[PDB]
Amino acid sequence: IVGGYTCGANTVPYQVSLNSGYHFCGGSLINSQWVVSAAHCYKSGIQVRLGEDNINVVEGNEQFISASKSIVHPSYNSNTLNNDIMLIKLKSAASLNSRVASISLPTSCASAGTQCLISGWGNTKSSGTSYPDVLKCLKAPILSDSSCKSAYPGQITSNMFCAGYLEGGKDSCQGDSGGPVVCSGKLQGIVSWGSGCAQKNKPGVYTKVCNYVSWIKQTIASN
Template identity: 65%
Template sequence: MRSLVFLVLLGAAFALDDEKIVGGYECKPYSQPWQVSLNSGYHFCGGSLVNENWVVSAAHCYMSRIEVRLGEHNIVITEGSEQFIYSDKVIRHPNYNSWTLDSDIMLIKLSKPATLNQYVQPVSLPTGCATAGTNCSVTGWGNTMSSTADSNKLQCLEIPILSNSNCNNSYPGMITNTMFCAGYLEGGKDSCQKGESLSMDRRNKKEEEGKKEEEEEGEKEEEGKKEEEEEGGKKEEEEEGEKEEEGKKEEEEEGKKEEEEEEEEDKEWKYLMKFEQQS
C-alpha cells in the first residue's frame, strides 16, 4: 500500500512554466490508480484521490470549476477505464501564499463519488513524516523533453527525500515549515510539475519491519536457548553439588558410625580387661 507523503514537488514552485519529468519512465498502466488528471479543456495539473469523494492537489492549480479525470493512463485516447467527474467544491488552504507558495495545497470535492475499481483507488494518507533518504515515487503527465508537448502516458520516477539542510542550501530563504525537498542534488532526474503526487510504498517498509521483527524474534529465541542452556548447566552443577554434599554427608555419617563402633569396641575391650583382672 502506498502512502501520499507530499503533494507538490518543490521544483514546481520555481519552474511552473517548465512542466516535465526528466529521467523517468512510463508507468505500468494503472499501477498508480489514485493519480488523477485535472482538466479544463486540456490537462493542466495532476492530483491524488484520497477517498471516493475528495482529491488533493496544489493550490496554485486552482480553478473555480475543474473536470477530474480518473482511471487515466494515456490522456489523449479513450481506453475504457476513465471516469470524468466535475468538481463540486474547490478549496485552497486558507494560508496559501501565491508569492511564496507556502501551504500550497488544495482540496477538490467531487460532484459525485468515484467508482472504486482496479483502475481507480485512493492513496493512503501518511501517518508521519518520511525521513531523509527515503525513496519515493513521483508520477504525472509531464514533458519528457524540453519541448512544450506533454507526455501522453503516465510517467514514473523514483527520487529520495532530501534533508532540511540540503533543501535550505538549495533554495536559501525560500523553504517554509510546510515544505520539504525530494530529488537529486546533482540533477539529471527531476519533476517540475503541478500538483503531482509523491508517494512512498509502505509495503517495503512493512517488509523491512517484518524482517527486523523476525531477526529480533530469532535473537530472542537464541538468547532464550542460551539462557535455558545456562540454566540447565547451572541446574546440573547444582545437582552435582547437591550430590557431592550428600556424598560428603554420607561419608561423615559413615565416619561417625565407624567412630561409634570403635568407641563401642574400646568399651567392650575395657570391660573384658576389667573382668579378667577381677577374675
C-alpha cells in the same frame, strides 16, 4: 517528469488528471469523493479524470467527474507557495476498483533518504518542451532539510521538503504540479515548485502533506 519511465497503464491508481478543456495539473484521490492537489493549480471549471493512462485516447477505464467545490488552504501564499495545498470535492463518488483506488494519508512524516514515487503528465525535457500522452513515473529520495535550504536559501518553509538529485537529470516539471509523492505507501508530498526542471543543485520542492492531515480530516468531515 524528466528522466523517468513509463509507469504502465493504471499502475498508479490514485493519480488523477485535472482538466479544464486540457490537462493542466495532477492530483491524488484520497477517498471516493475527494482529491488533493496544489493550491497553485486552482481554477474554476475543473473536471477530474480518474483511471487515465493516455490522456488523449479514451481507453475504457476512465471516470470523468466534475468538481462541485474547491477549497484552497486558508493560509496559502501564492508569492512564496507556502501551504500549497487544495482539496477538490467530486460531484458524485468515484467507483473504486483495481484501476481507480485511493491513497492513504500519512500518520507520521517521511524520513530523509526514503525513496518515493512521483508521477505525472508534465514536461519530459530540461529546457526544450515535450509533453507525454501516457503517465510517467520517477523514483527520487527525500533530501535533508539542510541540503534543501542550501539549494534554495531563504525560500524553504517548514511546510516544504526537497526530493530528487543534486546532480540534476531527474525531476518533476511543469504539468506535474499538484500530483503525488508517495513514500512507503502514503501520500507524503504534492508537486509544488522548483527552479527549472532537473537542473544541477536545484531539486524539486514539495508540499509536506503530514503537516496538513488535521485540516484535511476536519474539512472532509464538514463538506
